[PDB]
Amino acid sequence: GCASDPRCNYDHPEIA
């Protein structure tokens, strides 16, 4: 779910 966060896409790229 976090991957959906614009701040997560940068923190968890491997996920998104």
PDB file of C-alpha atoms in Angstrom:
ATOM      1  CA  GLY A   1       0.000   0.000   0.000  1.00  0.00           C
ATOM      2  CA  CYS A   2       2.767   2.430   1.012  1.00  0.00           C
ATOM      3  CA  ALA A   3       4.064   2.253  -2.571  1.00  0.00           C
ATOM      4  CA  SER A   4       0.969   4.331  -3.387  1.00  0.00           C
ATOM      5  CA  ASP A   5       2.378   7.170  -1.276  1.00  0.00           C
ATOM      6  CA  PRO A   6       4.299   9.749  -3.389  1.00  0.00           C
ATOM      7  CA  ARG A   7       6.831   9.714  -0.559  1.00  0.00           C
ATOM      8  CA  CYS A   8       6.963   5.917  -0.561  1.00  0.00           C
ATOM      9  CA  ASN A   9       7.573   5.537  -4.298  1.00  0.00           C
ATOM     10  CA  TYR A  10      10.894   7.224  -3.516  1.00  0.00           C
ATOM     11  CA  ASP A  11      11.480   5.375  -0.239  1.00  0.00           C
ATOM     12  CA  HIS A  12      10.430   1.944  -1.543  1.00  0.00           C
ATOM     13  CA  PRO A  13      11.057   1.858  -5.333  1.00  0.00           C
ATOM     14  CA  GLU A  14      11.634  -1.911  -5.410  1.00  0.00           C
ATOM     15  CA  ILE A  15       7.999  -2.163  -4.281  1.00  0.00           C
ATOM     16  CA  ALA A  16       6.502   0.136  -6.912  1.00  0.00           C
TER      17      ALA A  16
END
